[PDB]
Amino acid sequence: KKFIVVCGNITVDSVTAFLRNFNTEIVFLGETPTIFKCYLAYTTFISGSAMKWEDLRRVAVESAEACLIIANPLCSDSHAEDISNIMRVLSIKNYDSTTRIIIQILQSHNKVYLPKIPSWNWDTGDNIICFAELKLGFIAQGCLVPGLCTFLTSLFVEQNKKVMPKQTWKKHFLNSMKNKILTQRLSDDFAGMSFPEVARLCFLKMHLLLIAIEYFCGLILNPPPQVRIRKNTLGFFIAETPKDVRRALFDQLDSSGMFHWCKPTSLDKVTLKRTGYKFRNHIVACVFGDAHSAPMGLRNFVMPLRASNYTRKELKDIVFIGSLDYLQREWRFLWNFPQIYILPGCALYSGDLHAANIEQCSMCAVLSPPPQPLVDTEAIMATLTIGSLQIKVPILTELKNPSNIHFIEQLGGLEGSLQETNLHLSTAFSTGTVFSGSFLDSLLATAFYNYHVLELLQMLVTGGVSGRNRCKLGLLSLHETILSDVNPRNTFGQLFCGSLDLFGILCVGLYRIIDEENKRFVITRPANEFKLLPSDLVFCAIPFSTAC
């Protein structure tokens, strides 16, 4: 009865990249013509074009629950692929303008067009995914707030829960990973209550950590007092299973005011000279490329580090180390961001790392290059030279293939038996010195089944989708910080409550030292009654302009 159509690809990978990553029947459509015949009881296929009207009727899109548009047969021109796919959205909508569409855009700035189609509207369910935009987002956040990256990831990662842990601290880490982001609409008897009033009851009565809500037209993280809940309001939670969540059913900016802006200055000024100095508490991003390399959307990485709810005062400088020839091709889209600088060179060269004052930086991001026809070698070689420096430097390495974790740990020092084949079980992931977007492959199915989850994810990771006034996610010390005035700081739940109903700060996770170099690990949503240490730091939603 119910089915979905798939468009614009014949990639053996994509079929599994979808089918494995995906009750509801599937049907394909595309240019190439039937080797993968094993998986062909749970699906159907067609050889046509999405443009041709006859072919769309042939598959009967009208009654299809939704229609996905898949991209990147490692296209020659990324730009052309999107234009091409955006062309399909027109063709498809022209057929049955009420059909739900989920299009993959390869490079973010090409999303802009999709709304400009009249036939398209968000409310019926139409949606766009950009992995480039999200994979770079997670990393960004990790550069803003130590650990925040892995925190965010664990809400979407799903441990298989077979691994019996050795040590107490690793026992904590894994069971915290059980936390997801479930969605649920709130009871009627809530109506009229202020957010913090509601947040409390769910936490205390139901042991549910609720963190944002929708009206569905407007999503907001940790609403202030003035905003009251309405009837039929959708809430955003953090919890193990959906059963548990169901219990709760009973200064200079841009035009849009979303990020700091400036008059588009040319690269010549921004490009650092190497012949003939100092930076402090800044972010070094290493990128790899050349004239022949595909573009990585660097906009997506600056933008979150340039949100409007930060302040010119507290913004960080961003030095890119890389091929100027590669980086000048991105510059068009990085024009209007401030305090961005480019050092031409290579991160593998420790001389060029010192030129960028990598010793006095705040975080070093090692950005994998995008794919071409030896997969993470570069990222591993950087982490080698950086990690072993005559100066440990803060670091965040991206892996395209997470199985390569055992190489990074090897460089750390821990021997083969103590090395993990699985990134998520790794100690390097729990600290947050690595990241791997592999898990976002399932995302296309997620945005189908519950797109609100994507909505939230999008804004946490990217910092936008009133304006300047919004909650950051931040890490707080408990020592010489405002929290240190809470009367009972003895237990997480105790801390959570005071902080909220005193300062409107929504405590959401901890960052605990490992006690067995002062490396800490991420605990998402601990038990209400969770013994807290004085050394702990705390992940939390800090509202804009708070003294701290």
Smallest separation, CB 285 to its own copies (Å)? 20
Q: Which stretch binds its own copies (CB under 8 A): 116-124, 222-230, 358-366, 502-510?
A: 116-124
How far apart (Å, rounded) are the C-alpha atoms in residues 182 and 208? 10
The size of the interface with its own copies (CB under 8 A), counted in residues, is: 42
CB atoms within 10 A of CB 126: 22
Q: In this complex, which beta carbon is closest to its own copies, that of residue 34 or of residue 275?
A: 275
Q: Using the rule CB under 8 A, is 419 a contact of its own copies?
A: yes
Q: Which of 79, 85, 117 is nearest to 102 (CA)?
A: 85
Q: Using the rule CB under 8 A, is 380 a contact of its own copies?
A: yes
Smallest separation, CB 267 to its own copies (Å)? 9
Q: Using the rule CB under 8 A, is 469 a contact of its own copies?
A: no
Q: Using the rule CB under 8 A, is 286 a contact of its own copies?
A: no
Instruction: Map the footprint of its own copies across residues 343-362, applying CB under 8 A.
Output: 350
Q: What is the DSSP letter of 426?
A: S
Indicate which single residue of 113, 156, 341, 439 sits in contact with its own copies (rule: CB under 8 A).
Answer: 113
Q: Using the rule CB under 8 A, is 377 a contact of its own copies?
A: yes
Q: Using the rule CB under 8 A, is 413 a contact of its own copies?
A: yes
Q: Using the rule CB under 8 A, is 406 a contact of its own copies?
A: yes
How far apart (Å, rounded) are the C-alpha atoms in residues 132 and 297? 6
Q: Using the rule CB under 8 A, is 90 a contact of its own copies?
A: yes
Indicate which single residue of 40, 262, 384, 548 sits in contact with its own copies (rule: CB under 8 A).
Answer: 384
Q: Using the rule CB under 8 A, is 265 a contact of its own copies?
A: yes
SS3 annotation, 198-253: HHHHHHHHCCCEEEEEECCCCCEECCCCCCECCCCCEEEEEECCHHHHHHHHCCCE
Q: In this complex, which beta carbon is closest to its own copies, that of residue 84 or of residue 491?
A: 84
Q: Using the rule CB under 8 A, is 93 a contact of its own copies?
A: yes
Looking at the DSSP bridge assignments, the partners of residue 214 are: 234
Is the sign of the CA dihedral 386, 387, 390, 393 positive or negative? positive
As given in the structure block, the two tokens for residue 30 are 């595309």
Indicate which single residue of 218, 276, 373, 534 sits in contact with its own copies (rule: CB under 8 A).
Answer: 276
Q: Using the rule CB under 8 A, is 243 a contact of its own copies?
A: no
Q: Which stretch binds its own copies (CB under 8 A): 93-101, 150-158, 203-211, 457-465?
A: 93-101
Q: Which stretch binds its own copies (CB under 8 A): 23-31, 88-96, 182-190, 323-331?
A: 88-96
Q: Which stretch binds its own copies (CB under 8 A): 98-106, 274-282, 478-486, 512-520?
A: 274-282
Indicate which single residue of 43, 84, 293, 328 sits in contact with its own copies (rule: CB under 8 A).
Answer: 84
Going edge to edge, which strands form the sheet with 434-435? 340-344, 318-322, 283-287, 363-367, 395-398, 434-435
Q: Using the rule CB under 8 A, is 116 a contact of its own copies?
A: yes
Smallest separation, CB 78 to its own copies (Å)? 14
Q: Using the rule CB under 8 A, is 416 a contact of its own copies?
A: yes
Element (H, E) at 524: strand 520-524
Q: Using the rule CB under 8 A, is 117 a contact of its own copies?
A: yes
Smallest separation, CB 405 to its own copies (Å)? 12
Q: What is the DSSP annotation of 442-454? A: THHHHHHH-HHHH
Q: Using the rule CB under 8 A, is 293 a contact of its own copies?
A: no
Smallest separation, CB 533 to its own copies (Å)? 31
Indicate which single residue of 95, 122, 169, 216 sits in contact with its own copies (rule: CB under 8 A).
Answer: 95
Q: In this complex, which beta carbon is closest to its own copies, that of residue 360 or of residue 388?
A: 388
How far apart (Å, rounded) are the C-alpha atoms in residues 5 and 92? 11
Q: Using the rule CB under 8 A, is 415 a contact of its own copies?
A: yes
Q: Using the rule CB under 8 A, is 299 a contact of its own copies?
A: no
- How buried is 517 (Cβ within 10 angstroms: 0-12 exposed, 13-18 middle, 19+ buried)? exposed
DSSP 3-state of 535: coil
As given in the structure block, the two tokens for residue 58 are 């042939």
Q: Which residues contact 510 (CB under 8 A, 6 or more apart)?
A: 492, 522, 523, 526, 530, 532, 536, 537, 538, 539
Instruction: Map the footprint of its own copies across residues 519-538, applying CB under 8 A.
Output: none
Q: Using the rule CB under 8 A, is 122 a contact of its own copies?
A: no
Smallest separation, CB 445 to its own copies (Å)? 28
- Residue linked to tokens 């008897």: 189
Smallest separation, CB 399 to its own copies (Å)? 14
- How buried is 518 (Cβ within 10 angstroms: 0-12 exposed, 13-18 middle, 19+ buried)? exposed
Smallest separation, CB 314 to its own copies (Å)? 27
Please state the φ and ψ torsions of residue 478, each to the nearest 5 degrees: 70, -5
- How buried is 23 (Cβ within 10 angstroms: 0-12 exposed, 13-18 middle, 19+ buried)? exposed
As given in the structure block, the two tokens for residue 288 are 């790899």
Q: Residue 520, Cα to own-chain centre: how many angstroms?
A: 21
- How buried is 287 (Cβ within 10 angstroms: 0-12 exposed, 13-18 middle, 19+ buried)? buried
How far apart (Å, rounded) are the C-alpha atoms in residues 423 and 150? 11
How far apart (Å, rounded) are the C-alpha atoms in residues 202 and 198? 7
Indicate which single residue of 86, 136, 334, 440 sits in contact with its own copies (rule: CB under 8 A).
Answer: 86
Indicate which single residue of 40, 60, 74, 112 sits in contact with its own copies (rule: CB under 8 A).
Answer: 112
Indicate which single residue of 216, 407, 439, 544 sits in contact with its own copies (rule: CB under 8 A).
Answer: 407
Smallest separation, CB 438 to its own copies (Å)? 19
DSSP 3-state of 57: helix
Smallest separation, CB 22 to its own copies (Å)? 29
| Interface ranges with its own copies (CB under 8 A) | 80, 83-84, 86-87, 90, 93-95, 97, 112-113, 116-119, 263-266, 274-276, 350, 374, 377-378, 380-381, 384-385, 387-388, 406-407, 410-413, 415-416, 419
